[PDB]
Amino acid sequence: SLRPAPP
Amino acid sequence: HMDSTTIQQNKDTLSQIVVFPTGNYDKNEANAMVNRLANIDGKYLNALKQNNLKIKLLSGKLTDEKEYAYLKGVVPKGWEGTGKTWDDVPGLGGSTVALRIGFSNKGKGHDAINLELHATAHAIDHIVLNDISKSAQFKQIFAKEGRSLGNVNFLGVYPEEFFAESFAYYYLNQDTNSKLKSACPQTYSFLQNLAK
d(CA B45, CA B37): 9
Residues of B with CB under 8 A from a CB of A: 76-79, 82, 84, 86, 89-96, 109-112, 115, 118-119, 122, 126, 131, 151, 154-155, 160-161, 164-165
Residue B149 near residue B169, CB atoms below 8 Å: yes
Using only C-alpha atoms, chain A has a radius of gyration, in whole angstroms, of: 6
8 Å CB contact between B162 and B149: yes
**Inter-chain residue contact A4 with B78, CB threshold 8 Å:** yes
Cα–Cα dist B99/B14, whole Å = 14
H or E element that contains B98: strand B97-100
Q: How far apart are CA B175 and CA B154, in angstroms?
A: 22
Enclosing domain of residue B79? 1-196
* Buried b / exposed e along B98-117 (16+ C-beta atoms within 10 A): bbbbbbbeeeeebbbbbbbb
> Rounded to whole angstroms, how far apart are CA atoms B1 and A3?
30
Which among B181, B60, B170, B36 is positioned nearest to B116, based on CA atoms?
B36
Domain count for chain B, please give it: 1
Contact state of B89 with A4 under an 8 Å Cβ cutoff: yes
Smallest Cα distance from B181 to chain A, Å: 22
Q: How far is A7 from chain B (nearest CA, A)?
A: 5
Which of B95, B110, B155 lies closest to A5 in CB terms?
Answer: B110
CB contacts, 8 Å: B164 with chain A: 3
SS3 B38: coil
Provide the shortest C-alpha distance from residue A4 to chain B (in Å): 4
